[PDB]
Scaffold this active site. Sequence first.
Site, PDB file in Angstrom:
ATOM      1  N   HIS B  41      -2.988  -9.973   8.326  1.00  0.00           N
ATOM      2  CA  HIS B  41      -3.289  -9.081   7.207  1.00  0.00           C
ATOM      3  C   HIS B  41      -2.539  -9.451   5.902  1.00  0.00           C
ATOM      4  O   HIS B  41      -2.805  -8.840   4.866  1.00  0.00           O
ATOM      5  CB  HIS B  41      -3.111  -7.594   7.583  1.00  0.00           C
ATOM      6  CG  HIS B  41      -1.704  -7.073   7.549  1.00  0.00           C
ATOM      7  ND1 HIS B  41      -1.125  -6.650   6.367  1.00  0.00           N
ATOM      8  CD2 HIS B  41      -0.826  -6.863   8.563  1.00  0.00           C
ATOM      9  CE1 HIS B  41       0.092  -6.233   6.690  1.00  0.00           C
ATOM     10  NE2 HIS B  41       0.313  -6.324   8.002  1.00  0.00           N
ATOM     11  N   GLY B 143       6.883  -3.122   4.477  1.00  0.00           N
ATOM     12  CA  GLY B 143       7.522  -4.427   4.361  1.00  0.00           C
ATOM     13  C   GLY B 143       8.049  -4.962   5.682  1.00  0.00           C
ATOM     14  O   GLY B 143       8.454  -6.122   5.763  1.00  0.00           O
ATOM     15  N   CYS B 145       6.292  -5.443   8.438  1.00  0.00           N
ATOM     16  CA  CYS B 145       5.270  -6.202   9.171  1.00  0.00           C
ATOM     17  C   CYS B 145       5.728  -7.630   9.404  1.00  0.00           C
ATOM     18  O   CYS B 145       6.309  -8.256   8.511  1.00  0.00           O
ATOM     19  CB  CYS B 145       3.927  -6.158   8.449  1.00  0.00           C
ATOM     20  SG  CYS B 145       3.277  -4.487   8.221  1.00  0.00           S
TER      21      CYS B 145
END
Lengths: 301, 305
Positions: B41, B143, B145
Amino acid sequence: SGFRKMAFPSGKVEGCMVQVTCGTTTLNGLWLDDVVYCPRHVICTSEDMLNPNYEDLLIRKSNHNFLVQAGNVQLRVIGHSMQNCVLKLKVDTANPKTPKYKFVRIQPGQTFSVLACYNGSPSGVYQCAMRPNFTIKGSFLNGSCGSVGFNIDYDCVSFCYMHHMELPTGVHAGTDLEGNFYGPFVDRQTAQAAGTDTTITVNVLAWLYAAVINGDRWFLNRFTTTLNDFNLVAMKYNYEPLTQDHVDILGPLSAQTGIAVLDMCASLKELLQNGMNGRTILGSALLEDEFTPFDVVRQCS
Amino acid sequence: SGFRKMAFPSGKVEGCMVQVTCGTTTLNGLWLDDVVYCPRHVICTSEDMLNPNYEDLLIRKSNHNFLVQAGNVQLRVIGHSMQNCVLKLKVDTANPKTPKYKFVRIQPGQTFSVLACYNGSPSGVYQCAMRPNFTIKGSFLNGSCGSVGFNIDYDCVSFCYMHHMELPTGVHAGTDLEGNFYGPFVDRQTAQAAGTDTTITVNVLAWLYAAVINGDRWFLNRFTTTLNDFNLVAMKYNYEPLTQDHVDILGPLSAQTGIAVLDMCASLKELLQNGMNGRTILGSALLEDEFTPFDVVRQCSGVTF
Ligand SMILES: O=C1N[C@]2(CCOc3ccc(Cl)cc32)C(=O)N1c1cncc2ccccc12
Ligand SMILES: O=C1N[C@]2(CCOc3ccc(Cl)cc32)C(=O)N1c1cncc2ccccc12
């Protein structure tokens, strides 16, 4: 979102753990620059259990009596000195993995991460608070002496604790990195006992603010209290007195959530009176006191 | 003595964390050998995340669109490919800090340590469990991820999780290191909900053995039960079924403490039907289910890494 008991990443500390051996005793040491720090009780024998004279035992030692092992490399001890209850072994090599560090003595209620080690090898990392009775509720087995407690600020490791002993209740006692014990404890096998422990009130309030930031509000009430009325109620539940310093420290969380400190104090008083009634706060059925106001802000922002 | 929620030492994983930037998105990547792994993503825009065609978005990217930073050193991306929900960025340099590692997919109930990172920098380490509903009750902000979950077996790191998203209840969802999601989740900003959670029974029993090893015996009783009778009671309280495999796995703790597994089950049965009555077990008023039988043995014996 979410709230967890969180330790600092331990990598900067793992690169400092070494094994220190004096005769039959083996424990852990902290290798920073060209000095290995470790509990001085590594020089004790079975005869020095109750009343060791560390100055007399240390004077009988030579550098080659200290076997220091960093991984599978034996370090060469070129000097030794004692500072309070810590032994400082000068070694012929500066640790290349030495991070930016400081030695800090913490106050009760402060939290830190513990890197539990056995034979100079890290086995686990967990979060701890310095209890108001100056003990820590750690998870330590025989051989864990010399394991350290720390905080990381940006890239700097503030070393605040070195493990020394276990009290008869299973709680732990140790020193700062200058060898000064936290609490009325001594490094002797003489009769010692942890004083009655109390709940770290400012940390419970910070954790109630963390729960509000995470959307939990069931425990909030329309009441406020005076600081003195709160303390009178708190003392009855073995809670530490809440000072004006604590009220000031809770200011940022009070501003962020819109719940005044004395207003949150009234929620805490109610919780102490009623219990939780089958409800939980941040997945917990007890009031958590091992998150400082500073921990709540860094984890939630 | 003492029992704590304890994570594996994170040093071997910290040396692998990098920052990955693609346009406006900055998240974390895992640099192992000459490959940086991160959520797919990272290539997504605003309307994209609503219904994204990752093959179409990735085909429009060039190697120089991925800014990979390891500390204050920029890595050079020389290739990119996608494996399920994970992006693999081939870099021109092998990570010198690459530990011995494996990619393992874990089952619900299994625990792991999470190294929470923001901008390629580790900020915290915590221990958690893969819930029976395939979510983790983590602690993550925007943040995080690309933050990874891991275990250590001897000197080998087993990477088992990569953080992707947060569900509306505050619980977290992610994938294994091959990009396969744990749970019926998708990496798209859409209506997704965690299923009803259950308690990890074998882990509660392992934690009751840890409490006995630490001198907490108030909950013990003279009674035993059949596995059939226990599983009927357990289902009633949203507890996972306890299998013969679980009974066998609890064998060493049963032998060490002298409390047979079905004997500990009759204690758990009474605890469920009657409560704690103001008492605590290992400083807790709830039955803890995030310590596996192995975690209990490792901590109550002191295995090192
Ligand atoms: O390694 C040591 N030596 C001890 C043993 C004797 O009494 C003393 C007295 C003074 C000093 Cl400084 C150390 C010691 C001690 O408590 N620990 C231990 C530390 N932490 C946890 C322990 C868990 C079980 C067993 C021993 C543990
Ligand atoms: O960074 C992202 N982007 C999100 C937002 C949109 O929905 C999705 C759907 C799929 C994927 Cl792969 C990511 C995302 C997401 O949840 N997170 C976050 C991860 N974890 C915790 C968060 C805590 C607050 C805020 C956002 C957090």
